[PDB]
Amino acid sequence: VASYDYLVIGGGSGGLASARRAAELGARAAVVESHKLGGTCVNVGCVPKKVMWNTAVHSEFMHDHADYGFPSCEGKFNWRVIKEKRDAYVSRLNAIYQNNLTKSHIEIIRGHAAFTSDPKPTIEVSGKKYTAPHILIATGGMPSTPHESQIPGASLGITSDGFFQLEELPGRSVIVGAGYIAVEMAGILSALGSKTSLMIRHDKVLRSFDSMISTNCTEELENAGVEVLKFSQVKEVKKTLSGLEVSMVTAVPGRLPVMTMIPDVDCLLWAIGRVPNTKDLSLNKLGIQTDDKGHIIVDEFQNTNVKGIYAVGDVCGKALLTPVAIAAGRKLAHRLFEYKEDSKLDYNNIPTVVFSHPPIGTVGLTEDEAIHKYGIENVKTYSTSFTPMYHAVTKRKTKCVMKMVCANKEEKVVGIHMQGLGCDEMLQGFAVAVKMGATKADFDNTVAIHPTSSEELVTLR
Amino acid sequence: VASYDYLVIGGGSGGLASARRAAELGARAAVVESHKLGGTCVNVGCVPKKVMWNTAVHSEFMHDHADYGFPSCEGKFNWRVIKEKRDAYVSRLNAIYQNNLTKSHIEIIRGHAAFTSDPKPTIEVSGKKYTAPHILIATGGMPSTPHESQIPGASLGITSDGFFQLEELPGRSVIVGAGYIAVEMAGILSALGSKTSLMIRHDKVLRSFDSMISTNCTEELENAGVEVLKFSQVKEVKKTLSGLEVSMVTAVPGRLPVMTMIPDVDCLLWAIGRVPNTKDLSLNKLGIQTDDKGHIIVDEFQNTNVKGIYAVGDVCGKALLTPVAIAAGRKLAHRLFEYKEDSKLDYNNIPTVVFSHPPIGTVGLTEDEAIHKYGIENVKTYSTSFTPMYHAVTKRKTKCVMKMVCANKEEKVVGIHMQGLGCDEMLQGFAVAVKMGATKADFDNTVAIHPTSSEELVTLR
Ligand SMILES: Cc1cc2nc3c(=O)[nH]c(=O)nc-3n(C[C@H](O)[C@H](O)[C@H](O)COP(=O)(O)OP(=O)(O)OC[C@H]3O[C@@H](n4cnc5c(N)ncnc54)[C@H](O)[C@@H]3O)c2cc1C
Ligand SMILES: Cc1cc2nc3c(=O)[nH]c(=O)nc-3n(C[C@H](O)[C@H](O)[C@H](O)COP(=O)(O)OP(=O)(O)OC[C@H]3O[C@@H](n4cnc5c(N)ncnc54)[C@H](O)[C@@H]3O)c2cc1C
Ligand SMILES: *CC1=C(CCCCCC(=O)O)C(=O)c2ccccc2C1=O
Ligand SMILES: *CC1=C(CCCCCC(=O)O)C(=O)c2ccccc2C1=O
């Protein structure tokens, strides 16, 4: 059996980040990947999603062209064109990167890995055994789809994975879900020309976000032309002559249930959650702990319940973002190969951007979370809403809302929430300030940059 | 004679800001304006400039419309259309603000103001004399134009003031200057279709900015189609049958000087600097101190050399920005009506954005300034350059450059400099962090937001 200092299962964001840092510290490592190196981020997540978002934004530009003094443009979008360019970009990334694994002298093991019953930490790929005193599980996850038994015909729908396989613009789309992936997909499809509906179980999207964001985002979706079907769930899906027929039940509180048949649907996209990839790792052979969802259980140092075995990224079910998987992986490498016992990722104040229209930026606690932690008596919030200057000459409008959540006497900034033009690139710097424990005084004592939307955050009344 | 509790000369950003708050604090102030209320910010500066920049940005992105999968869009810009909408927008702004002015009860005196003798601070406007225990001078400045004795025919050219009076797109434009106003005007004109040249005295633009920015900005201007005329100065201007003829002398080090006659110029714009408005204030009658340039000298509390008289804004020649004039003005009305010996604007680490293409963001010290203040041995810089993923599918390209200047062993961040897409809305948050005395560790400890350009600043190595 081949022996290494570090074995990483999964060549995605978390695995590659941890493997490369370990190698820089001298560790002899190998990465096991059953599919495409790069994982979800480059192949069916972050990167291709952003390219499609940039495309959707270009559609918004086409619409304001006349208002800005130019002759109107046609508007016939060609999905095939961007699809081909997007695929080429992903190919370049996959190539330019594989080179990095080579430069780091990290061995790549192609195939599906599974733990062996060997008393010593050992895995098997294809038919060969590999071992090491340190083994990292970074297998990520996958999109969740309903069972045929629960919702007959569910298999007729696609997920975000299928979204990236599309070669043409669906004429009519129905997205099921209220999370950020559901919101991003609905926004992109609608902006590019698809007659889009977003089906949600309650009254608003992004219910885990601050109330202001949940409310505002739902309203902007409706203003953009996305039909938000509230308190609705899919009961059945059936193939028709034109496409698919979606049977929906709407149960609004205070009203009676009603069934609706949505016809002529070209694309039914399920965006109801993610499930971890742990089913076939033979975790039981070592007694590796997981929850009833399949997530690997870990402590603050990413240790599983078994010595010498760790886990990071989507597989653990906490803060499912690329930079998080990367940071957790690198912090672990320093702990194991630089012997920094205190090296770990701080999961507090992790910033996130949702690429909606306009984009959302948030970091820290929501107003409700702050109230629960410090007591309503010790929480003070500042907020504002305005129409960005960009829309001064356009008929089409979007608004910008910002909220600052402060705690205690010194009004420590414990949360920042916003949606509006430019919020995607505006958040990072404010996140650094929040991580530093900035107070509102720190914000107010920073001179504003005029004229921008960002200056509103340092001039809150 | 008319008497008030606070007299303010100038109805601009610094004047209105101080007076408006003065009224708020229960003060009894009045403001004298010889021209349009609001000042440079709303009439011939910040706001209208940004509307024109947004228009230019629109035009630039639309050149990538076909690359993003849409049918090519023509680009015959109609200047008159935007001019009218811009004027209307400014009108709505003045009205909204005017409602807040009359609300705080502030007497507006029309006419050119000028000081008189009197053993006590007194001013006369159109024959009528006014006075008060506190007089604020906030007359701002104006564009500088060469004297006919120096450059014959110089009066044939316009300045930024005239730029905002333009009702048609000049076919051929020549902008003279290397500062940010010159850079912004050249970029807007060229983006909108004018055959544009930018004449500078040396090799690069923005020489007072960090070397990386000066170099990069000059290159981006050339890549955008702006002809940068280096080591060149205007000697004479003459009216011709088809516009203007600009006589220029070019003297590149190592080469022989040469005379060039630029024909068929439709618009010659002087952007060689600004001078303070104090030539007709008769401040000599009261011994008010000024420098050789005409700037009113003041201390940290904006006090002139004559008790009871203060000055803020562009007229003082330091940090010529709207938020600085506003803040200094508020901090003053604060001191004179709140009694806080420590109340004054901190002029350190003021952030600024230059609306070039792409935009520039900077705060803190340049690498050279830091090297001189801390010593080469105590300064370390981190920098990166990349092509934003927005261009992954476009033939046209712009780059993004970022530089972090650190000082001493803890690597305190004393400067951040960058140019690229989104940098205009990206800077504010980082400025808050720098003002807080953030170190590189603080930046690196903040989790990145992917995929964005802003995350590159927290992952520099
Ligand atoms: C549509 C979509 C949009 C998103 N947008 C964003 C965004 O804008 N920003 C952001 O920060 N995050 C975003 N995310 C989330 C981000 O992509 C994930 O958090 C990140 O990819 C997780 O990294 P990971 O390393 O845990 O797993 P993954 O990158 O999924 O990698 C796990 C790898 O392990 C391999 N593997 C699994 N089992 C085995 C085995 N037994 N043997 C060998 N190899 C195996 C897989 O094939 C895979 O390559 C998005 C996700 C989706 C789905
Ligand atoms: C083209 C251009 C673009 C700019 N872009 C930006 C930008 O994007 N961001 C930024 O922060 N800054 C920008 N600035 C700078 C900003 O506009 C100025 O810093 C700010 O307006 C200065 O405010 P102020 O109150 O000192 O003077 P001003 O606003 O110039 O006001 C002085 C007022 O006093 C009046 N006045 C003068 N003399 C007398 C007198 N004797 N009696 C009565 N009234 C008198 C004037 O007519 C005027 O209205 C720009 C400037 C220009 C020229
Ligand atoms: C998110 C992403 C990935 C997955 C990577 C984590 C790799 C980390 C490391 O080495 O520390 C890529 O593989 C990749 C490749 C080229 C360009 C962009 C990207 C990504 O954004
Ligand atoms: C820059 C600006 C100005 C100039 C003024 C100072 C106003 C300050 C204060 O009273 O506190 C405006 O007058 C104005 C009016 C409406 C909308 C925007 C603006 C500006 O950006």
Side-chain angles (χ1 to χ4, degrees), chain A residues 21 24 50 58 61 67-69 71 73-74 76 78 85 323 351 390 425 428 435 445 447 449 451 453-454, chain B residues 50 58 61-62 67-69 71 73-74 76 78 85 390 425 428-429 435 445 447-449 451 453-454 461:
Chain A
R21 184 52 55 78
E24 178 174 56
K50 187 67 181 298
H58 248 284
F61 280 38
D67 284 332
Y68 264 102
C73 314
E74 296 187 298
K76 191 58 171 298
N78 189 325
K85 297 183 181 187
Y390 167 80
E425 295 288 0
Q428 193 76 79
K435 189 62 179 294
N445 289 317
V447 180
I449 302 168
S453 283
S454 70
Chain B
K50 186 70 183 296
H58 218 297
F61 275 125
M62 291 312 218
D67 292 334
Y68 264 97
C73 196
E74 68 178 66
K76 50 159 293 182
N78 192 318
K85 295 185 177 184
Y390 163 79
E425 294 290 359
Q428 193 75 80
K435 192 65 183 300
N445 291 329
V447 176
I449 300 163
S453 286
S454 70
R461 205 170 189 182

Side-chain angles (χ1 to χ4, degrees), chain A residues 200-269:
Chain A
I200 63 178
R201 293 169 68 74
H202 298 265
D203 60 324
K204 302 168 180 177
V205 296
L206 306 181
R207 301 195 309 138
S208 64
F209 287 61
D210 182 276
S211 63
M212 179 188 78
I213 297 182
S214 179
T215 297
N216 192 69
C217 190
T218 307
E219 303 182 339
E220 290 283 34
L221 280 162
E222 302 178 308
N223 297 327
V226 175
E227 175 184 52
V228 183
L229 304 171
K230 303 168 182 181
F231 293 105
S232 301
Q233 297 173 49
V234 176
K235 176 183 179 178
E236 188 182 10
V237 188
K238 179 176 178 297
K239 189 67 177 185
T240 64
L241 293 177
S242 62
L244 306 174
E245 168 180 287
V246 179
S247 291
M248 165 183 80
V249 175
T250 297
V252 174
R255 302 179 180 177
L256 285 174
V258 58
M259 189 177 93
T260 300
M261 221 68 96
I262 306 178
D264 318 311
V265 177
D266 301 301
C267 175
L268 173 68
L269 196 163

Side-chain angles (χ1 to χ4, degrees), chain A residues 9-15 32-47 49 109 111-114 138-141 160-161 164 180-181 184-185 274 277 280-281 312-315 319-325 353 355, chain B residues 448-451:
Chain A
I9 305 175
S13 299
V32 186
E33 175 57 53
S34 54
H35 298 294
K36 306 175 180 181
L37 285 171
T40 301
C41 173
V42 291
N43 300 295
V44 295
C46 317
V47 182
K49 178 280 298 297
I109 306 173
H112 178 83
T139 55
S160 54
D161 285 351
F164 289 116
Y180 87 98
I181 292 178
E184 294 186 341
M185 298 283 101
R274 304 274 295 179
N277 293 316
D280 304 297
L281 287 56
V312 309
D314 282 14
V315 81
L320 310 192
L321 298 164
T322 282
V324 176
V353 162
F355 291 97
Chain B
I449 300 163
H450 187 67

Side-chain angles (χ1 to χ4, degrees), chain B residues 168-236:
Chain B
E168 303 294 309
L169 172 75
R172 178 77 172 98
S173 297
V174 175
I175 297 78
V176 186
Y180 86 100
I181 292 176
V183 168
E184 293 184 344
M185 304 221 132
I188 289 168
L189 286 164
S190 186
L192 296 175
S194 186
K195 187 63 174 181
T196 313
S197 295
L198 178 66
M199 198 185 308
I200 63 179
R201 293 171 68 80
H202 302 266
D203 61 322
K204 300 168 181 177
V205 297
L206 306 182
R207 298 193 304 135
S208 66
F209 286 61
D210 185 272
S211 60
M212 181 189 73
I213 298 299
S214 177
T215 297
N216 193 69
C217 192
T218 305
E219 303 184 330
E220 289 284 28
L221 281 164
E222 301 180 305
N223 294 323
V226 174
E227 176 184 47
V228 182
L229 301 171
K230 302 174 178 62
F231 296 103
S232 300
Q233 305 174 191
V234 179
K235 280 292 184 178
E236 187 173 9

Side-chain angles (χ1 to χ4, degrees), chain A residues 46-58 77 79 82-83 86 163-164 185 188-189 191-192 357, chain B residues 68 389:
Chain A
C46 317
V47 182
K49 178 280 298 297
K50 187 67 181 298
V51 173
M52 296 307 291
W53 184 76
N54 287 331
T55 304
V57 173
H58 248 284
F77 176 61
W79 186 287
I82 184 66
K83 207 286 189 172
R86 195 190 74 213
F163 176 81
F164 289 116
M185 298 283 101
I188 287 162
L189 286 166
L192 296 172
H357 298 276
Chain B
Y68 264 97
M389 68 170 287

